[PDB]
Write an enzyme that holds these catalytic residues in place. Structure first.
Site, PDB file in Angstrom:
ATOM      1  N   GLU A   1     154.838  98.674  11.203  1.00 37.55           N
ATOM      2  CA  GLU A   1     154.941 100.048  11.037  1.00 37.55           C
ATOM      3  C   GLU A   1     154.203 100.428   9.618  1.00 37.55           C
ATOM      4  O   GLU A   1     153.476 101.147   9.597  1.00 37.55           O
ATOM      5  CB  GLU A   1     155.959 100.872  11.065  1.00 37.55           C
ATOM      6  CG  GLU A   1     156.839 100.590  12.695  1.00 37.55           C
ATOM      7  CD  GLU A   1     158.128 101.626  12.552  1.00 37.55           C
ATOM      8  OE1 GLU A   1     158.045 102.681  11.886  1.00 37.55           O
ATOM      9  OE2 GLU A   1     159.092 101.284  13.369  1.00 37.55           O
TER      10      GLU A   1
ATOM     11  N   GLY B   1     154.588  78.954  -6.368  1.00 35.76           N
ATOM     12  CA  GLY B   1     154.651  78.885  -7.883  1.00 35.76           C
ATOM     13  C   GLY B   1     156.114  79.227  -8.372  1.00 35.76           C
ATOM     14  O   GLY B   1     157.139  79.416  -7.543  1.00 35.76           O
TER      15      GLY B   1
HETATM   16  N1  LIG Z   1     165.109 114.496  19.571  1.00 36.18           N
HETATM   17  C1  LIG Z   1     165.258 113.317  18.889  1.00 36.18           C
HETATM   18  N2  LIG Z   1     164.136 112.698  18.321  1.00 36.18           N
HETATM   19  C2  LIG Z   1     163.903 111.791  17.720  1.00 36.18           C
HETATM   20  C3  LIG Z   1     165.295 110.713  17.622  1.00 36.18           C
HETATM   21  N3  LIG Z   1     164.994 109.748  17.009  1.00 36.18           N
HETATM   22  C4  LIG Z   1     163.707 109.660  16.612  1.00 36.18           C
HETATM   23  N4  LIG Z   1     162.949 111.091  17.003  1.00 36.18           N
HETATM   24  C5  LIG Z   1     161.664 111.320  16.989  1.00 36.18           C
HETATM   25  O1  LIG Z   1     160.736 110.487  17.776  1.00 36.18           O
HETATM   26  C6  LIG Z   1     159.498 110.128  16.889  1.00 36.18           C
HETATM   27  C7  LIG Z   1     159.045 108.711  17.203  1.00 36.18           C
HETATM   28  O2  LIG Z   1     159.662 108.314  18.207  1.00 36.18           O
HETATM   29  P1  LIG Z   1     160.428 106.698  18.608  1.00 36.18           P
HETATM   30  O3  LIG Z   1     161.611 106.607  17.479  1.00 36.18           O
HETATM   31  O4  LIG Z   1     160.998 106.516  20.253  1.00 36.18           O
HETATM   32  C8  LIG Z   1     159.301 105.477  18.265  1.00 36.18           C
HETATM   33  P2  LIG Z   1     158.477 104.937  19.647  1.00 36.18           P
HETATM   34  O5  LIG Z   1     159.575 104.100  20.545  1.00 36.18           O
HETATM   35  O6  LIG Z   1     158.221 106.324  20.553  1.00 36.18           O
HETATM   36  O7  LIG Z   1     157.067 104.087  19.374  1.00 36.18           O
HETATM   37  P3  LIG Z   1     157.284 102.824  18.393  1.00 36.18           P
HETATM   38  O8  LIG Z   1     157.305 103.658  16.950  1.00 36.18           O
HETATM   39  O9  LIG Z   1     155.958 102.241  18.499  1.00 36.18           O
HETATM   40  O10 LIG Z   1     158.582 102.203  18.762  1.00 36.18           O
HETATM   41  C9  LIG Z   1     159.984 110.217  15.417  1.00 36.18           C
HETATM   42  O11 LIG Z   1     158.647 110.676  14.816  1.00 36.18           O
HETATM   43  C10 LIG Z   1     161.121 111.303  15.602  1.00 36.18           C
HETATM   44  O12 LIG Z   1     160.352 112.846  15.192  1.00 36.18           O
HETATM   45  C11 LIG Z   1     166.389 111.231  18.391  1.00 36.18           C
HETATM   46  O13 LIG Z   1     167.379 110.781  18.319  1.00 36.18           O
HETATM   47  N5  LIG Z   1     166.480 112.576  18.666  1.00 36.18           N
HETATM   48  N1  LIG Z   2     158.632  88.763 -11.936  1.00 36.29           N
HETATM   49  C1  LIG Z   2     158.770  87.708 -12.396  1.00 36.29           C
HETATM   50  N2  LIG Z   2     157.489  87.105 -12.914  1.00 36.29           N
HETATM   51  C2  LIG Z   2     157.612  85.877 -13.431  1.00 36.29           C
HETATM   52  C3  LIG Z   2     158.726  84.792 -13.458  1.00 36.29           C
HETATM   53  N3  LIG Z   2     158.374  83.745 -14.020  1.00 36.29           N
HETATM   54  C4  LIG Z   2     157.200  83.785 -14.180  1.00 36.29           C
HETATM   55  N4  LIG Z   2     156.567  84.872 -13.972  1.00 36.29           N
HETATM   56  C5  LIG Z   2     155.003  85.382 -14.120  1.00 36.29           C
HETATM   57  O1  LIG Z   2     154.194  84.600 -13.512  1.00 36.29           O
HETATM   58  C6  LIG Z   2     152.950  84.249 -14.501  1.00 36.29           C
HETATM   59  C7  LIG Z   2     153.167  82.806 -14.818  1.00 36.29           C
HETATM   60  O2  LIG Z   2     152.848  82.067 -13.698  1.00 36.29           O
HETATM   61  P1  LIG Z   2     153.818  81.182 -12.710  1.00 36.29           P
HETATM   62  O3  LIG Z   2     154.402  82.356 -11.798  1.00 36.29           O
HETATM   63  O4  LIG Z   2     154.528  80.438 -13.597  1.00 36.29           O
HETATM   64  O5  LIG Z   2     152.682  80.241 -11.972  1.00 36.29           O
HETATM   65  P2  LIG Z   2     152.723  79.147 -11.242  1.00 36.29           P
HETATM   66  O6  LIG Z   2     152.333  79.135  -9.807  1.00 36.29           O
HETATM   67  O7  LIG Z   2     154.495  78.590 -11.494  1.00 36.29           O
HETATM   68  O8  LIG Z   2     151.757  78.014 -11.988  1.00 36.29           O
HETATM   69  P3  LIG Z   2     151.972  77.820 -13.532  1.00 36.29           P
HETATM   70  O9  LIG Z   2     152.089  79.285 -14.431  1.00 36.29           O
HETATM   71  O10 LIG Z   2     150.560  77.392 -13.747  1.00 36.29           O
HETATM   72  O11 LIG Z   2     153.077  76.972 -13.756  1.00 36.29           O
HETATM   73  C8  LIG Z   2     153.106  85.267 -15.692  1.00 36.29           C
HETATM   74  O12 LIG Z   2     152.520  86.315 -15.421  1.00 36.29           O
HETATM   75  C9  LIG Z   2     154.727  85.642 -15.716  1.00 36.29           C
HETATM   76  O13 LIG Z   2     154.812  87.026 -16.075  1.00 36.29           O
HETATM   77  C10 LIG Z   2     160.101  85.592 -12.999  1.00 36.29           C
HETATM   78  O14 LIG Z   2     161.044  85.145 -12.786  1.00 36.29           O
HETATM   79  N5  LIG Z   2     159.947  86.825 -12.454  1.00 36.29           N
END
Ligand SMILES: Nc1nc2c(ncn2[C@@H]2O[C@H](COP(=O)(O)CP(=O)(O)OP(=O)(O)O)[C@@H](O)[C@H]2O)c(=O)[nH]1
Ligand SMILES: Nc1nc2c(ncn2[C@@H]2O[C@H](COP(=O)(O)OP(=O)(O)OP(=O)(O)O)[C@@H](O)[C@H]2O)c(=O)[nH]1
Ligand SMILES: Nc1nc2c(ncn2[C@@H]2O[C@H](COP(=O)(O)CP(=O)(O)OP(=O)(O)O)[C@@H](O)[C@H]2O)c(=O)[nH]1
Ligand SMILES: Nc1nc2c(ncn2[C@@H]2O[C@H](COP(=O)(O)OP(=O)(O)OP(=O)(O)O)[C@@H](O)[C@H]2O)c(=O)[nH]1
Ligand SMILES: [Mg+2]
Ligand SMILES: [Mg+2]
Ligand SMILES: [Mg+2]
Ligand SMILES: [Mg+2]
Lengths: 428, 426, 428, 426
Positions: free
Chosen positions: A245, A10
């Protein structure tokens, strides 16, 4: 690997995409042709000798907006078959988006999506941009979501929904469209980040000193949020965050996945030289209701999950201290069943500056994703809006004539009510 | 003789491990791509503990680098000193666990395990005499916690009598970098309980405090913090790598410091923690070092040893000293305030004195304490788990990967039991 | 640490602030942009690379005065959001200041104040500038004081009140405004330093040889007093004094915290070369009624507490001797229940000279803060003034129509009477 | 052997203390950043009384610097000689008491105390043999008076048998730099009464007089005044730091000069107080020094010894002398005008003779008198308290910090009792 693909649905979806992609190009030193002068791989593919190309798909049941894309500054960035158009719009009719008109274009876009997936090695997810009030952005999106579920039940799907506040409503039937689509969204989305236009406007006047915001202006800010979100995927950090995440850390319960994104600092060129830009300061700004991107009544509810994505020069210790300080403040309330409320992510890239932009260059920045019970109020008001209109069958003829049955509406309403009740429950 | 396998799993492990390698290489005179710049025969003598030696006198760590997320691997290689690692020891999956322990432990970990196993077998069969394993990882994340423990289990099945060491970073209550830390910690610690000989518990908060107040630093980076950890690691194994006056290997410490199989969680401390501007106003000496080592400020685990009791302590000292002096200091420490030393274990102090001090300083100490105060750490975690589990929050993700409620219950129970045991002996 | 923040309320508050801040900039080698070319930290924060910024807040229920600030010599010193304006003034109506118009702007200023506090590390207090006769300076100030009490019950709050003598009155309803506000002030102020325009004028003619003083002229002198007060906080001395000290040393009893500030020497460029500027001499000048900044009848009352803040080249011994001499003089009377009457403070900075100024450079200077029973007479005359006007309900309609009730006035009067009685009592 | 801890609390203490350190360093040949420039083995021998010795033969005072107001600390460091102090011995709060004794003693002092305590413990355990403590501070202000006394109390709890010395500046009636001096003095002196072994009473007025009339100086600064105090301090402890012919440490003086536990307030005097233009017209000698020491003009406390009686006097002389000569002088002083010497104590003079004179002059004397005339000082203060307390003036601030009327009453009572006791023995 770890690539991610953007879908723009849209008018809203397209125009947001326009800004976002521009921002991305500037960030990675990609000129508007496609040559550079790796990290970026997660968003851009490569073909030919030097040309880089967006993993993006643009969908509209009308050629108007996407015609501008075709003939603009970024005409050469996209291959013509990633832009699908040409037909009568869902004239703010969910049913048309979903049944009549969605039916004709779906296969083409789905093929494109599949191709994009196949080009890549093990992409994590999809970023879906749209409005809830548009017939296309509502009806078609749900259909697309269904398709995606069918194809890749496993993979993550994030969305950026332009949500309507009742005071700044621009369309008559916004309530019906929002409700119908939201029900469909519920089952197939991992999380949906809500944006309110009114809030954006407020931010622009107060903190950017602009009295007359255009849509173009608004979108820039939104793009920055997106950048903040995905920077950890694109760049080297100290502590990293991915799409997987977010799903893990924001969703206590399947149904409750509608968090608000806030951003800071939002500063004019002038105000920066009289600004002590602190890590603590920006954190503080992050929890002040005037900085919310959705008008929600934040102080009345409680916070369930909060992700803080810092970018630029940051000392982790300082961040920790700021967090502690925030925790210590009494008025901000977390749910009693979660003691530890913040996921913290750090990124060595300073956020970027758009030529001819509104925003000052800053050395520290933050994007907060936060899930609050208060957002339920928004739904309540929407439901109220719906309820009166429904009462007289106002505008029902348009929907019934498009192959949508009447009990469906009732069902949707019921679902919404149940959802509302759920928020009320989990907040205890 | 007495040769070791190093393993680094998840982000933290990989970075800490890198730092460790940088340190130990520096100590033994090895350059990043450069083969050898060592100044002493002593360094040469025990290179084969941690390294292998290809043609033209090159040298390479018996280190394995593991992660479900490809990015960190990239970072490691991209750093200076990255060319020293054998390319076949980089063993990474495709998509990261995303702080889902179950994913780490089932879906991707299982797919990853076989390659790792093969490389470990290769490493073992290559060398004459295999001593032990050293794993660096977290308990807060999906990969380090889930896959790591699986790996450990596998290792145990293969070689039941070999030494298992782990350097495990731990969650802290005020600072949580993930909301699901209680779950992750719980599941992994259960696994550790059955398969590890000694586990070194390390807190980020404590490290931060040390950097701020003791080293008087305004801007601590992760690297700086990791430095301390690296130093500690180096200290533990100094007995294997140098001739001393009194020598204590991994096994010796383990035997000395574990009165009951279950209670094998050690709190490390280190000395001296000097600041840059502040160092020139100290007389470098045994007694000062000893005094520093038993301050609550220099416990790397965020627990107060004032609210528990030491079962046992091991003290590893580097540089020339009077053993007598050290012993007298120990005695002083014991008799003066025996209030926190268990009565049934008469002498609670173990001493090792190695002649070669680290690069930079002339005398240094590493302290490894088995304190009942460690129960406090577990208690908070348990409480948090209880808080979450009652509302069933975030259970659904774990369920989605094969896990079931019973496992959670069991692990928690085990943890509780462990806590109780610590209390009893206090 | 030890930082302090200035609040300027109403026209008087703003214009005083203007001079004061200018003086400060000159003192610390700060050009009117904000670059320097630490000590000053207590009044100026730093952000950016080199720019320094006043911890100051300017409030006015009308844009007129603060618009000049925005477009003047010091436009670049203040970030635009530390200047709050825009509305209809409290047209010399206390009630408007307090009820109708104060209500709309309060939150914004309070937020700013909080931000300022948060920027700093453990600031000691607040310096509040205003008139009693203005509707804003009266009604709004009380409201602000209340807010400050609520937020930081602990912290010190000092004020500079422009007090009206009946002979040089410029506003019709000065009596009502003064009385109402004074009651409110009573409970939440630690001490209030009264300044009389007439006295200033007198000083200007006699000791500065200027027949035609402007408001601009008057303010300079006032700024100097302020500087003298806070120099001990900003600079290295021999013997120091802080804001906490003043509260301790000037207030025998909770209610009796209205002391007079005097200043010397006040000399034209010409008179200095025929002047033996002695430490004793300046002390002597300090206790002579012609040098008082409030017209009070000083000889009739007794002195309760006296603080002497010297600045420049001083020998403490000499000061001591001067003090002794003063004590020995018979006509100057201290209360019998306080034998030792002087708090003494010394500062190594010579007071500064303003380009295009009236005041000669001096090497020794003194500011005396002194609490006398005589000031009660001023209140008595004010009360008399009030009493006749009240008698006919003159100008009451304006107040009643602004959400202020009539018994309030009576209550205020009663309170004032009680206060007056108290002074009479403590003087025995 | 015989090692001392120095402490400086509040503004006065910090500045006086600085001066003292400058003096004593100069005496023992120590430079500000420079390690050692001493000319004699003697200086070297007893450096360990006041100093510690880091690597490369550096030296550092066993001094602790305390204040609730950060500013003074800044001043101290900023001065030349500021680099000699160990940075860990700078222990300051955030906001100053503002001449509110209660704040000093409760709200901020309590928060401050723990760090101070820890550092003192550290200092103690470091050294083999701990002799005593020296506190410099005021009785007129909030920090020096309130927090100081709290600190002293704490110290007492820890080490009951160790020596407590305080150098306390006192209020004077004509010159009051604070209006609430009666209250402040009263509260702190009560506290002193129970926990100090010896207290040196010092008046600013007296010092000023000395500078004006004796030294013939028109422009006395605080530094100049402080100089005398520093000299006095140096004199007291000369017996610990040098070999003499007769030696008297802190303890010796205390035992000699305190007939009853309560009466431990000593009035110091010093000789010779020479002027710049006036010095060349004196024969430097014992008798002259003795004559100078017993003049009312050279009592640093603003009391007239003519209106009381000496219980005891200690005389510490520096430079080579005939002990016999000194003794004869003492005898002369005693017998000639025994009118102001108590009959029941037969010989009221104590003598110590140390061989090493200060830098500048060849012979010098410090006089420490326990005079009943000190009651006069207390009396005026008491009177002032009475005057204030009857009208309840300024009570409210003190109330606001936890204090209550009863405490004031009690302290005053105690003071009165003390006064009475002095009178009785006169
Ligand atoms: N002692 C350190 N602790 C760290 C460091 N970076 C992150 N952390 C700690 O480790 C925690 C998470 O570990 P990781 O960043 O290795 C995330 P992990 O790889 O174990 O699993 P995913 O999040 O699924 O990748 C995070 O909550 C921090 O408290 C570091 O450089 N040194
Ligand atoms: N944030 C933002 N909102 C927008 C913009 N243009 C339209 N809207 C919003 O979108 C709604 C209007 O619908 P559109 O996004 O035009 O929907 P469409 O999917 O193009 O379908 P039609 O409206 O039927 O042509 C209103 O709630 C507007 O406030 C924009 O550039 N930025
Ligand atoms: N002998 C000296 N006496 C001093 C000096 N400076 C001040 N004083 C005396 O000390 C008295 C107050 O002591 P301080 O300045 O240290 C104030 P204090 O820190 O004790 O408490 P606060 O006022 O709460 O900070 C004051 O009344 C003077 O009579 C000095 O350099 N030398
Ligand atoms: N000392 C001094 N007094 C002033 C100045 N300007 C006005 N005043 C006094 O302030 C009182 C008038 O009140 P304002 O300060 O104008 O009050 P306001 O808060 O601006 O509110 P309005 O008067 O209603 O606009 C009179 O008593 C004047 O004498 C000034 O520059 N210096
Ligand atoms: Mg459209
Ligand atoms: Mg990781
Ligand atoms: Mg006005
Ligand atoms: Mg002070």
């Amino acid at each position: 690997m770890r690539e991610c693909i953007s879908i723009h649905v849209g008018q809203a979806g397209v125009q947001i995409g326009n800004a976002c992609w521009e921002l991305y190009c500037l960030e990675h030193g990609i000129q508007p042709d496609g040559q550079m002068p790796d990290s970026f791989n997660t968003f851009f593919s490569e073909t030919g000798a030097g040309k880089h190309v967006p993993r993006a798909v643009f969908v509209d049941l009308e050629p108007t907006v996407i015609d501008e894309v075709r003939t603009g500054t970024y005409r050469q960035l996209f291959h013509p078959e990633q832009l699908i158009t040409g037909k009568e719009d869902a004239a703010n009719n969910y049913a048309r988006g979903h049944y009549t008109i969605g039916k004709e274009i779906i296969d083409l876009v789905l093929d494109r999506i599949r191709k994009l997936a196949d080009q890549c090695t093990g992409l994590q997810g999809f970023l879906v941009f749209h409005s809830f009030g548009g017939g296309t952005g509502s009806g078609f999106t749900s259909l697309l979501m269904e398709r995606l579920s069918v194809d890749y039940g496993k993979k993550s799907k994030l969305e950026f929904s332009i949500y309507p506040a009742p005071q700044v409503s621009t369309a008559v039937v916004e309530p019906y469209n929002s409700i119908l689509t939201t029900h469909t969204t519920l089952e197939h989305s991992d999380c949906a980040f809500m944006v309110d236009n009114e809030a954006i406007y407020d931010i622009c006047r107060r903190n950017l000193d602009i009295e007359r915001p255009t849509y173009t202006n608004l979108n820039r800010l939104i793009g920055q949020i997106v950048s903040s979100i995905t920077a950890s995927l694109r760049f080297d950090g100290a502590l990293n965050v991915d799409l997987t995440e977010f799903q893990t850390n924001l969703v206590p319960y399947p149904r409750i996945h509608f968090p608000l994104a806030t951003y800071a600092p939002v500063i004019s060129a002038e105000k920066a030289y009289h600004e002590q830009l602190s890590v603590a300061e920006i954190t503080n700004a992050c929890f002040e209701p005037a900085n919310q991107m959705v008008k929600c009544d934040p102080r009345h509810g409680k916070y369930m999950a909060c992700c803080l994505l810092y970018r630029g020069d940051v000392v982790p210790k300082d961040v920790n201290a700021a967090i502690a300080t925030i925790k210590t403040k009494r008025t901000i309330q977390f749910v009693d069943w979660c003691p530890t409320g913040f996921k913290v992510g750090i990124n060595y890239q300073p956020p970027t500056v758009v030529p001819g932009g509104d925003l000052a260059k800053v050395q520290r920045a933050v994007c907060m994703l936060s899930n609050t019970t208060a957002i339920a109020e928004a739904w309540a008001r929407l439901d109220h809006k719906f309820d009166l209109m429904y009462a007289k069958r106002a505008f029902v003829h348009w929907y019934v004539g498009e192959g949508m049955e009447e009990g469906e509406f009732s069902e949707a309403r019921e679902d919404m009510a149940a959802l509302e009740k759920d928020y009320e429950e989990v907040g205890v | 003789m007495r040769e070791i396998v190093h393993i680094q799993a998840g982000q933290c492990g990989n970075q800490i491990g890198a730092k460790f390698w940088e340190v130990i290489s520096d100590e033994h005179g090895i350059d990043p791509s450069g083969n050898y710049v060592g100044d002493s025969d002593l360094q040469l003598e025990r290179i084969s503990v941690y390294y292998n030696e290809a043609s033209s006198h090159k040298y390479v760590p018996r280190a394995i680098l593991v992660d479900l997320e490809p990015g960190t691997m990239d970072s490691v290689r991209s750093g200076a000193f990255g060319h020293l690692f054998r390319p076949d020891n980089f063993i990474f999956g495709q998509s990261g666990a995303g702080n889902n322990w179950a994913k780490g432990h089932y879906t991707e970990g299982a797919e990853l395990v076989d390659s790792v196993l093969d490389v470990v077998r290769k490493e073992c069969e290559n060398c004459d005499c295999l001593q032990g394993f050293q794993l660096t990882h977290s308990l807060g994340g999906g990969t380090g916690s889930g896959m790591g423990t699986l790996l450990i289990s596998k290792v145990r099945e293969e070689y039941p009598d070999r030494i298992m060491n782990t350097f495990s970073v731990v969650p802290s209550p005020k600072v949580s970098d993930t909301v699901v830390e209680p779950y992750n910690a719980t599941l992994s610690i259960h696994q550790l309980v059955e398969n590890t000989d000694e586990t070194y518990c390390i807190d980020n908060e404590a490290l931060y405090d040390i950097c701020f107040r003791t080293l008087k630093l305004a801007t601590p980076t992760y690297g700086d913090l990791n430095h301390l950890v690296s130093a500690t690691m180096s200290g533990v194994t100094t007995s294997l790598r140098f001739p001393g006056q009194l020598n204590a290997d991994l096994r010796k410490l383990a035997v000395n410091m574990v009165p009951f199989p279950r209670l094998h969680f050690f709190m490390p401390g280190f000395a001296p923690l000097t600041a840059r501007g502040s160092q020139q106003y100290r007389a470098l000496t045994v007694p000062e070092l000893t005094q520093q080592m038993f301050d609550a400020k220099n416990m790397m685990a965020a627990c107060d040893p004032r609210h528990g009791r030491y079962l046992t302590v091991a003290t590893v000292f580097r540089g020339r000293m009077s053993m007598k002096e050290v012993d007298e200091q120990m005695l002083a420490i014991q008799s003066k305030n025996s209030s926190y030393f268990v009565e049934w274990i008469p002498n609670n102090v173990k001493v090792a004195v190695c002649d070669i001090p680290p690069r930079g300083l002339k005398m240094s100490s590493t302290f490894i304490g088995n304190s009942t105060a460690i129960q406090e750490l577990f208690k908070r975690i348990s409480e948090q788990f209880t808080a979450m589990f009652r509302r069933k929050a975030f259970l659904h993700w774990y369920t989605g990967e094969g896990m079931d409620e019973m496992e959670f219950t069991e692990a928690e129970s085990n943890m509780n039991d462990l806590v109780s045991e610590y209390q009893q002996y206090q």
